[PDB]
Design a protein around this nucleic acid. Structure first.
Ligand SMILES: CC[C@H]1OC(=O)[C@@](C)(F)C(=O)[C@H](C)[C@@H](O[C@@H]2O[C@H](C)C[C@H](N(C)C)[C@H]2O)[C@](C)(OC)C[C@@H](C)C(=O)[C@H](C)[C@H]2N(CCCCn3cc(-c4cccc(N)c4)nn3)C(=O)O[C@]12C
Ligand SMILES: [K+]
Ligand SMILES: [K+]
Ligand SMILES: [Mg+2]
Ligand SMILES: [Mg+2]
Ligand SMILES: [Mg+2]
Ligand SMILES: [Mg+2]
Ligand SMILES: [Mg+2]
Ligand SMILES: [Mg+2]
Ligand SMILES: [Mg+2]
Ligand SMILES: [Mg+2]
Ligand SMILES: [Mg+2]
Ligand SMILES: [Mg+2]
Ligand SMILES: [Mg+2]
Ligand SMILES: [Mg+2]
Ligand SMILES: [Mg+2]
Ligand SMILES: [Mg+2]
Ligand SMILES: [Mg+2]
Ligand SMILES: [Mg+2]
Ligand SMILES: [Mg+2]
Ligand SMILES: [Mg+2]
Ligand SMILES: [Mg+2]
Ligand SMILES: [Mg+2]
Ligand SMILES: [Mg+2]
Ligand SMILES: [Mg+2]
Ligand SMILES: [Mg+2]
Ligand SMILES: [Mg+2]
Ligand SMILES: [Mg+2]
Ligand SMILES: [Mg+2]
Ligand SMILES: [Mg+2]
Ligand SMILES: [Mg+2]
Ligand SMILES: [Mg+2]
Ligand SMILES: [Mg+2]
Ligand SMILES: [Mg+2]
Ligand SMILES: [Mg+2]
Ligand SMILES: [Mg+2]
Ligand SMILES: [Mg+2]
Ligand SMILES: [Zn+2]
Lengths: 112, 120, 44, 215, 122
RNA sequence: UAAGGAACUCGGCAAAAUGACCCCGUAACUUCGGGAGAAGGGGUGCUCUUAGAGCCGCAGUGAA
RNA sequence: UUGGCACCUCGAUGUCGGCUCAUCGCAUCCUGGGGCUGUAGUCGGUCCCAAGGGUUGGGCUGUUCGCCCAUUAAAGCGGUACGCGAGCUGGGUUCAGAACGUCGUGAGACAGUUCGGUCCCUAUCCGUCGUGGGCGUAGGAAAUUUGAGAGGAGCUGUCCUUAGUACGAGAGGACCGGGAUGGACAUACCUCUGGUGUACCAGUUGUCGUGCCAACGGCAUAGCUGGGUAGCUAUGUGUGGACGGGAUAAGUGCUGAAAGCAUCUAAGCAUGAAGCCCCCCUCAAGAUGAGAUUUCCCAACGUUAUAAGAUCCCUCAAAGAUGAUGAGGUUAAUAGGUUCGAGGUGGAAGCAUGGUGACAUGUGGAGCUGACGAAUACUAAUCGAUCGAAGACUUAAU
């Protein structure tokens, strides 16, 4: 009954900080396409965590030039070099979908 | 889970009524599908009664009906009190399986399978 | 929507070939006449 | 050239060398044994017969398929093996390279092998034309009284009949399906597991047959 | 997921403000376009003084979608809006400036000038 | 109900949207009554003090 | 097609267009093969073979038709009651109202127009799609199978390279090969992204209850709102069809006479299409021609009881309208319960503390948790009953 876990255990990462929805993360994402491999930081608030094991994902949202952007990552993807927990948010639900229609001050998340 | 030919609210109410009736009378005759559904309800209630804490009692109060039971001699108690009193003590050392279903056969009016479900 | 021709006696009985009931699944009561299998006596 | 029997456990994902996401199907292929060699001389064609999952030994008054009956017990005992739940033939193998009674481990397949996976698709029950044959609905408004019906089933006086093969409601699913050119992602000797790229037919716990791709 | 009659904001300074998708290019029966695809569209709203006038039928490349795209590593990017950039025949933008972030996928389509002009590529 | 938003269809048919109360604001035209609820905006929960100060939620005519 | 004829139907053969669903022809729109060219190349023109597959989304109009916008490899022409209303619609057309123009003294009418205007039917037979029971298949049975035969599939774009080469003043720009990658379509599947998720978690309004507080229950679309497991799912994730062999079409030949020559043909010998038969997928021995392999079982006197093997009955789900199929039936994990997990929700109650209070913090990633996983006989799969062979004959090899 634990075959899936047994064969996907080697895929899991152990260098991952603890975080919950509402936290502000700095995600250091590897970019390999082009002529060189480099690192682009994506900073935003975690609006979603879902799944379990190797299939777990999380979603981060930021505003770039006034346009909302969301990146969803597999939690254990090798493409992520590291994650910093920059801020800890005070929120009341697991999914922060209500942020999607909020802008500016109304979209602010109180820190802990 | 079975729908029992009823809407969700009606089914929930019927299951509460059947569970309280079973707790009170300790042995009831119903149809096969209703009994197979209510065994789970009644046994989870008995689990709460064995737990015994205040939160368990209130969770049990979410499901039980407000019925009164006249005991041996003009002394009253509620179905919730019986569930957390005599019934819970009866099954302290039994790990699940507090009910049993005995089939009786079809009944005249509609050919439905009548069964007895009783506390063990 | 409606039968074009009436159904003969032969065709009707052919169709009723499978229209029947079966003997109940019944067992002798070792101590308590006969009973349905996996049912209690409920009268003995 | 190769074949093995297994049960579908479920779907998961692994990360490739380049960090690419590879959805995979976990197939558990323990306990495979060659039960019989069929040859051109005796049977008219060459194949090996492979039993997959061990059953309980025969007992009197057995009521279910969990226990081998006497014919099955004798057939398996002829190969010095326990009776098996599933038995299938592989005509794509080399009959010479197998001995009756030998095991068929997962290690017969290697990472990067291209395989064909055969299984029985999930059942759907009685289904209408819209779901079973991908047909279009009629209008949902504008006075329509035609939503999920199959539509016209023929022409007229010519031909005064419905042609064979007209697509109609009926039982859907539960058919044998072969998915070609899947790949072996990983073979794990412990747990006797083969990781297959992509999805394969059937419900969880269903039997699947894995063969080296014919194409 | 852009189809016929989908309206998209324009993310350049060509003079078009909003366009309406007339056609998704790329083969018969194609219904949907996404980031990096080329569409035919008409200008519904335009800024006065701009090069591209209301009513013109033009070609645009999609640079932002709400549906977003899935990348090979199992990661996704989605945007809060659908936006496109009006392009010439040789894939160069008709305007001089690009507004808003654009997806990395435009590199694969060789929309390199649009990529260079964008404030952010994600 | 994703994305789209009349591409449906003879026709937006049907559905969706609007909707109560209080306060701003309101065009052409006009028989000077009207048009007009034009349009378009804002507010609303709970606690305390005498209009402010707070408290909670995604959301306060929180349903109809 | 417009007609001509008036042979079936006036004790009724529903008319146009669209929708749904197709099916057939080839006089071929695309794609494949080829001859001629006033064929340099890139493109074309014309003719021959070829029906395998493919062959579009809008504006206007009831429209068919047609014009237009934007695509596409292409947007072929036809038959099937101008295919399809006991499958749908009902905009148009042969209905009662009304109006205009016009005609008529008039009632009224129309090489006309305009607004409005009931689409009934529980499928008996054949036909079709699925799914069972009987018997047969020279003993009975369990499983694995061959494949006579049948169905399915069959499309194609762009880019790179060859090569800026051949061709060509130039402009321009290849055939043949090599590689990459899409559109449409089909199919499987739920890891992912999402949808749903009426016995999952939470917030919240009105009102009535559980005597009151607190905590809860009922009703209001599941009262409403934010999320959401399994399952089922597409817009999501995989996979498939550009192959190879054989025989051919139009063609192209070689050898070669009749007919000293010439000649693809008359005898022979080749070569040559997305087309044919196979190669790929599925079904398939009621294939009454009823096939094959392995294993199991073996009775006496039509009867009675049996063997292998099954069923009845019962617990069920991966299966399912019901049958059927599959997992199990105590020598037992089949379901329920119980205990522990995954996932979901997001911080229970009670109590303490702070605050006038609304509330906040702590105890504490808490409490709760359908369908998912494991363990555990606590509950239910009791007892029992029913069906079920004994292998015919004739001739040949041994
Ligand atoms: C909806 C029910 C009616 O069906 C229809 O109206 C239709 C849709 F079924 C219909 O029109 C059929 C199809 C007609 O037949 C066609 O006649 C054409 C001339 C020729 C055609 N073919 C041969 C080419 C025939 O098929 C005709 C004549 O009905 C008028 C059939 C005859 C036998 C006929 O009169 C029958 C008896 C007709 N009728 C008069 C209705 C008369 C109209 N009506 C009355 C009512 C009503 C009355 C009382 C209460 C309520 N609530 C409603 N509703 N509608 C009824 O009372 O019932 C039905 C069956
Ligand atoms: K209430
Ligand atoms: K608490
Ligand atoms: Mg989670
Ligand atoms: Mg039910
Ligand atoms: Mg209700
Ligand atoms: Mg449609
Ligand atoms: Mg309807
Ligand atoms: Mg929607
Ligand atoms: Mg939406
Ligand atoms: Mg809109
Ligand atoms: Mg339209
Ligand atoms: Mg249309
Ligand atoms: Mg309406
Ligand atoms: Mg109101
Ligand atoms: Mg407010
Ligand atoms: Mg004629
Ligand atoms: Mg005559
Ligand atoms: Mg007539
Ligand atoms: Mg008649
Ligand atoms: Mg021809
Ligand atoms: Mg063809
Ligand atoms: Mg065509
Ligand atoms: Mg017709
Ligand atoms: Mg009609
Ligand atoms: Mg008809
Ligand atoms: Mg009409
Ligand atoms: Mg006159
Ligand atoms: Mg009208
Ligand atoms: Mg065959
Ligand atoms: Mg036949
Ligand atoms: Mg191609
Ligand atoms: Mg899942
Ligand atoms: Mg999901
Ligand atoms: Mg209270
Ligand atoms: Mg009441
Ligand atoms: Mg046979
Ligand atoms: Zn009895």
């Amino acid at each position: 009954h634990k075959l899936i876990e047994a064969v996907t255990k080697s895929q899991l990462r152990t260098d991952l900080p603890s975080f919950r929805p509402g936290d502000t993360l700095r995600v250091h994402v590897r970019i390999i396409e082009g002529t060189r491999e480099r690192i682009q930081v994506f900073e935003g608030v975690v609006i979603k965590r879902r799944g379990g094991g190797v299939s777990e994902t999380f979603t981060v949202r930021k505003i770039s030039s006034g346009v909302g952007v969301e990146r969803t990552f597999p939690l254990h993807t090798p493409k992520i070099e590291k994650i910093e927990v920059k801020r800890r948010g005070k929120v009341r639900r697991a999914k922060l979908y209500y942020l999607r229609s909020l802008r500016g001050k109304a979209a602010r998340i109180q820190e802990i | 889970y079975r729908k029992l030919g009823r809407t969700s609210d009606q089914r929930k109410a019927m299951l509460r009524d059947l569970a309280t009736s079973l707790i009170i009378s300790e042995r009831i005759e119903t149809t096969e599908a209703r009994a197979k559904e209510v065994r789970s309800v009644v046994e989870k209630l008995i689990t709460l009664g064995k737990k015994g804490d205040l939160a368990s009692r209130r969770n049990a109060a979410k499901t039980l009906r407000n019925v009164e039971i006249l005991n041996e001699d003009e002394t009253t108690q509620t179905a919730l009190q019986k569930l957390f009193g005599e019934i819970a003590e009866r099954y302290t050392e039994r790990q699940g399986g507090y009910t049993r279903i005995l089939k009786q056969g079809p009944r005249r009016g509609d050919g439905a399978e009548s069964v007895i479900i009783e506390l063990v | 929507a409606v039968p074009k021709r009436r159904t003969s006696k032969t065709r009707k009985n052919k169709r009723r070939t499978h229209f029947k009931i079966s003997v109940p699944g019944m067992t002798e009561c070792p101590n308590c006449e006969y009973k349905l299998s996996h049912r209690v006596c409920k009268n003995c | 050239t190769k074949g093995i029997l297994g049960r579908k456990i479920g779907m998961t994902q692994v990360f490739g060398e380049n960090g690419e996401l590879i959805p995979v199907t976990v197939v558990e292929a323990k306990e495979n044994v060659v039960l019989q060699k069929k040859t051109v001389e005796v049977d008219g064609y060459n194949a090996i017969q492979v039993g997959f999952e061990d059953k309980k030994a025969y007992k009197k008054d057995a009521k279910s398929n969990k226990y081998a009956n006497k014919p099955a017990e004798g057939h398996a005992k002829k190969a010095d093996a326990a009776p098996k739940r599933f038995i299938r033939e592989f005509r794509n193998v080399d009959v010479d390279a197998y001995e009756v009674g030998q095991e068929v481990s997962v290690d017969t397949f290697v990472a990067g092998d291209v395989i064909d996976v055969t299984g029985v698709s999930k059942g759907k029950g009685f289904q209408g034309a819209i779901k079973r044959h991908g047909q279009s609905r009629g209008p949902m408004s504008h006075g329509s009284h035609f939503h999920r019906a199959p539509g016209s089933v023929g022409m007229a006086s010519d031909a005064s009949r419905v042609f064979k093969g007209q697509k109609m409601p009926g039982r859907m699913g539960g058919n044998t399906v072969t998915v070609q050119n899947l790949e072996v992602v990983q073979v794990d000797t412990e747990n006797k597991v083969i990781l297959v790229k992509g999805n394969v037919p059937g419900p969880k716990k269903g039997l699947v047959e894995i063969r080296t791709s014919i194409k | 997921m852009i189809q016929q009659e989908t309206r998209l904001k324009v993310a350049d300074n060509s003079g078009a403000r909003e366009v309406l998708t007339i056609k998704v290019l790329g083969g018969s029966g194609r219904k949907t376009a996404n980031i990096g695809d080329v569409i035919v569209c008409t200008v519904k709203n335009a800024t006065p003084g701009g090069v591209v006038k209301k009513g013109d039928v033009v070609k645009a490349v999609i640079v932002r979608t709400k549906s977003g795209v899935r990348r090979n590593d199992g990661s996704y990017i989605k945007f809060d809006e659908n936006a496109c950039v009006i392009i010439r025949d040789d894939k160069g933008p008709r305007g001089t400036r690009i507004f808003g972030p654009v997806a990395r996928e435009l590199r694969e389509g060789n929309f390199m000038k649009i990529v260079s002009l964008a404030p952010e590529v994600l």
